[PDB]
């Protein structure tokens, strides 16, 4: 017979689950400078090896269940760390599972043609040569949620056989002949233009740098269209020019190629000057008629909007350039204009 | 419409072009094709694509499943039932200490081990290989005296490991584990020793039926820790020791590996060193002039975003798009 | 909609030491000649060893039911009309039935809404039917703004408001000089919105 | 007074929660040729009675947390099993709760 209540033990569940999720999905992705090496356990010397980032320990106390409690506010240390290099990357998860789940995996894939000149070209009768080159660099053609230097680990890729497939519309011979004749005049000539329509250039920035100057010599700016810029981690954009670039010891996202930029909130101001004397928007258009003040931190004249630290001029410029919105009152643009890479969809104020 | 659309003569839809020239390299691969278009049809290049196949080795550091795979439910500090040498202070005397369980509840214990059951009238004994299986145990919550107990415990030869994530490949179809090394003609006999135990109270039982109360089957398995790493090794020194009993494990970080979205970078784009060539075979002047300033990959990415929704997955072009979980970027 | 809990399997806590109720045992060797003889081990093997007989000691908890019960309580039970809740014992409670303290120190018995309410039924509780449903801490529209201002008590702020009057919300103002005075409201209960409706004033 | 740390017991949470999802949502829907009849408990002879489909037991070892780990896979036994005759059917759930309980 038992006297009194039954012996039993207690445990908080929801708090424990929250701690587990928070630790697992954030605290392990802090910048390495906050983690410390273990005790009595041998670790890899190379910091890019999977082993180093796996056996490196990070204290749970940095991010416990009570971090910025009650507040919607991304951590400081993480907003510079790439967020796509994360084992919860839905697309990366899908692709990795689609290939399989083992270490050794045969594959049979179909690669499209992306070069804009021939991407949608309507090839006519004749005998045409067609040759292309393919990389076998694991660090380049593979993606890893941790970005570790794969070729140091021992990832390898080998091609067995490559074939070309093309589908012909079984067009009636008479109409096909008429179309072929009509498409070889001097007038009915096909045309194309690259969708980005750009001219990428890149500029190094030293560590702990604040200002970045830039110059272009006496060009001719005819039919110029506009600017577009962002910021990348040098440890990641890869040197496209040669073949194997030995030095690409990182295997995560490639914001120069994947289009997944994440360092866009680190810009402060932009100044544009033609002939070293005139400022381009400098017809007293903006509130600060010489700079595109993006985020002014200290200054409190009352120029920031959206209950954040982006200035009114910069917000107006972004909205105008993306959706022609701003001269007749701000309002959420339609989903049909705000694509996934559009400005508004990724604008997240915090406090 | 009836006429002037589809031809009646025997005409194919998909044509498969065998490569004519191919060259391997330590870091690249070149393929060349002779694209021939019939004399009465028009080919839309958009439908063309390069079909590849080969061997991909993801390497030792590809772990797509977060968390462990072996004894996940076990406590992260629970040690495998093991024996180990230990310095003895009684009277380099290295006595061995034993730590392990005994879930199986047999009938009788003799010098041939526990009596699993009876066959006809002859008592039957468990196989040294697997019969005291770790999984099968007593199935009554309320305690009942067990006068004959059996279980498995690793010998001191095998290194000690936490139960969390420890695994050793099986050797015989009955699901046992155990190094099958034998030094004879039939050099595959299992070396499983039976160790006997009784109550510490039973000391003056000479002549008395000092029956062994618990019999342990000792093994030597090829223990592995595939996806877990020790998070706390109390003592730097190697070997097996009472100190090492408290080591705790932890699952290794998840790590996914796959191809780039839209197979980015697999083809050589915007590098005039290795530039694709398309030209009428009569001449040979390449009709694809590519610069290093243009960025074709990003351009195609933005174009795909512009046309279709960038959330549906198309497995053919490997069109799944990278994206973070918004509850992770912003806490 | 209480579809129940998928707790088919049992969930067990365990000792972090692998096992607890061990029994101290001594190794015993078979004798010679005597089939039933047995002599204690003299060769080096520590005569005191911890071994467990039978299954390991453990405790049980239904996780998937506890999660549902906590959710039900924290999201419905605390929001029942006050006439059901009873005041606590030996605790000094406020008197104003609108002060946050009164809404916080009032204890509502879990038995009103537990795991077994309308089992398998899609049916809002009659009591909660008339209770304002937006006055709830799960109000995403409220939560977004509350975190947008910040999680502190003392919050410096900077906002932009629109002009909503239909007659001039879209007037195309032609050139000239105009006066555009407008009033504003300082009442806390009107410009601030609480999840519980407590009288901020 | 207590000497040393406090008494405590450990339980893996997320792993156990997944066992259930898997078990209770898949392992009970495997074709009957895998499930085996119970012990010392009666059961209807008719294999279409609810009692037959309920009393019959299926070992958890068939589908535990470690099945095809990391692989976006559908169990072979479940490829031909009807996937709509499942208690998670949203439409069926709605239509059943609409009438009542």
């Amino acid at each position: 017979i038992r006297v009194g209540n039954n012996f039993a033990m207690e445990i908080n569940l929801n708090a424990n689950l929250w701690r587990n999720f928070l630790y697992s999905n954030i605290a392990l992705y802090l910048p390495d400078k906050l983690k410390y090496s273990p005790s009595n356990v041998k670790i890899s010397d190379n910091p890019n090896t999977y082993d180093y980032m796996n056996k490196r320990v990070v204290a749970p106390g940095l991010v416990d269940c009570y971090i910025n409690l009650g507040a919607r506010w991304s951590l400081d240390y993480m907003d510079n760390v790439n967020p796509f290099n994360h084992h919860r990357n839905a697309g990366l998860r899908y692709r990795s599972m689609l290939l399989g789940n083992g270490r050794y995996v045969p594959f049979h894939i179909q690669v499209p043609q992306k070069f804009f000149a021939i991407k949608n070209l309507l090839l006519l009768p004749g005998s045409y040569t067609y040759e292309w080159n393919f990389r076998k660099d694991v660090n380049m053609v593979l993606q890893s949620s941790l970005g570790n230097d794969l070729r140091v680990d021992g990832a390898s890729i080998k091609f067995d056989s490559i074939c070309l497939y093309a589908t012909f519309f079984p067009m009636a011979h008479n109409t096909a002949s008429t179309l072929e004749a009509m498409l070889r005049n001097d007038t009915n000539d096909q045309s194309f233009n690259d969708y980005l329509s750009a001219a990428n250039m890149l500029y190094p920035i030293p560590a702990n740098a604040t200002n970045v100057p830039i110059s272009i010599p006496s060009r001719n700016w005819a039919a110029f269209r506009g600017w577009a810029f962002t910021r990348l981690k040098t440890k990641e954009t890869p040197s496209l020019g040669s073949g194997y670039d030995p030095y690409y010891t990182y295997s995560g996202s490639i914001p120069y190629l994947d289009g997944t930029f994440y360092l866009n909130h680190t810009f402060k101001k932009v100044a544009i000057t033609f002939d070293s004397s005139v400022s381009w928007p400098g017809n007293d258009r903006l509130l600060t008629p010489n700079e595109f003040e993006i985020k002014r931190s200290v200054d409190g004249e009352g120029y920031n909007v959206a209950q954040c630290n982006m200035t009114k001029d910069w917000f107006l410029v972004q909205m105008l350039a993306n959706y022609n919105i701003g001269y007749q009152g701000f309002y959420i643009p339609e989903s049909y204009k705000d694509r996934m890479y559009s400005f508004f969809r990724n604008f997240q104020p915090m406090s | 419409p009836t006429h002037d659309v589809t031809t009646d003569r025997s005409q194919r839809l998909t044509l498969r072009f065998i490569p004519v020239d191919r060259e391997d390299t330590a870091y690249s691969y070149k393929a060349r094709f002779t694209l021939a278009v019939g004399d009465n049809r028009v080919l839309d290049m958009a439908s063309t694509y390069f079909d590849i196949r080969g061997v991909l080795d993801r390497g030792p550091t590809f772990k797509p499943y977060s968390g462990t795979a072996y004894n996940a439910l076990a406590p992260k500090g629970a040690p495998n039932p093991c024996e180990w040498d230990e310095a003895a202070t009684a009277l380099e005397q290295q006595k061995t200490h034993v730590f392990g369980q005994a879930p199986y509840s047999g009938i009788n214990i003799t010098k041939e081990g526990i009596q699993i059951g009876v066959e006809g009238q002859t008592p039957k004994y468990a196989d040294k290989t697997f019969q005291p299986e770790p999984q099968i145990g007593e199935s009554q919550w309320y305690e009942t005296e067990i006068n004959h107990a059996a279980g498995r415990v690793l010998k001191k030869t095998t290194p000690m490991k936490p139960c969390y994530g420890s695994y050793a490949k099986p050797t015989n179809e009955n699901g046992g584990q155990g190094i099958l090394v034998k030094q004879q003609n039939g050099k595959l006999e299992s070396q499983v020793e039976m160790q006997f135990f009784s109550t510490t109270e039973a000391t003056a039982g000479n002549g008395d039926n000092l029956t062994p109360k618990v019999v342990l089957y000792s093994e030597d398995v090829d223990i592995e820790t595939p996806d877990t790493h020790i998070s706390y090794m109390p003592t730097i020194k190697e070997g097996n020791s009472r100190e090492l009993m408290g080591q705790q494990s932890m699952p290794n970080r998840p790590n996914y590996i796959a191809f780039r979205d839209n197979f980015i970078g697999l083809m050589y784009y915007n590098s005039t060193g290795n530039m694709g060539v398309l030209a009428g075979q009569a001449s040979q002047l390449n009709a694809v002039v590519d610069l290093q300033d243009r960025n074709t990959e990003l351009s195609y990415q933005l174009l795909l975003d512009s046309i279709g929704d960038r959330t549906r997955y198309f497995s053919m072009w490997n069109q799944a798009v990278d994206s973070y979980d918004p509850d992770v970027r912003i806490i | 909609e209480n579809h129940g809990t998928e707790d088919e399997l049992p969930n067990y806590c365990f000792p972090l030491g692998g096992v607890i109720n061990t029994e101290t045992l001594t190794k015993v060797k078979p004798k010679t000649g005597q089939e039933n003889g047995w002599e204690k081990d003299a060769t080096e093997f520590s005569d005191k060893n911890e071994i467990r007989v039978g299954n390991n000691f453990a405790m049980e908890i239904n996780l998937n039911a506890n999660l549902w019960r906590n959710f039900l309580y924290s999201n419905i039970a605390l929001y029942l009309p006050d006439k059901l809740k009873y005041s606590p014992s030996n605790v000094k409670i406020s008197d104003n039935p609108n002060t946050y303290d009164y809404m916080n120190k009032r204890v509502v018995a879990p038995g009103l809404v537990d795991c077994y309410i309308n089992l398998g039924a899609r049916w809002s509780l009659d009591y909660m039917d008339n209770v304002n449903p937006f006055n709830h801490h799960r109000n995403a529209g409220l939560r977004y703004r509350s975190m947008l201002l910040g999680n502190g008590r003392y919050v410096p702020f900077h906002i932009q408001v629109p002009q909503k009057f239909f007659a001039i919300k879209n007037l195309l103002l032609l050139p000239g000089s105009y006066t555009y005075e407008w009033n504003f409201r300082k009442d806390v209960n009107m410009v601030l919105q609480s999840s519980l409706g407590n009288d901020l004033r | 007074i207590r000497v040393g740390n406090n008494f405590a017991m450990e339980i893996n949470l997320n792993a156990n929660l997944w066992r259930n999802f898997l078990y209770s949502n898949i392992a009970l829907y495997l074709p009957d040729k895998l499930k085996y009849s119970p012990s010392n408990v009666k059961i209807s002879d008719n294999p279409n009675t609810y009692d037959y489909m309920n009393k019959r037991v299926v070992a958890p070892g068939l589908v535990d947390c470690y099945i095809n780990l990391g692989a976006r896979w559908s169990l072979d036994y479940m490829d031909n099993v009807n996937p709509f005759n499942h208690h998670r059917n949203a439409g069926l759930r709605y239509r059943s709760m609409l009438l009542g309980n």
Partner: peptide
């Protein structure tokens, strides 16, 4: 119910109009 109940509630919220007029 393993989550942060954040984006989860907003996603529950997404059961409303989107594409056109």
């Amino acid at each position: 119910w393993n989550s942060s109940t954040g984006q989860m509630l907003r996603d529950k919220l997404k059961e409303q109009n989107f594409q056109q007029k």
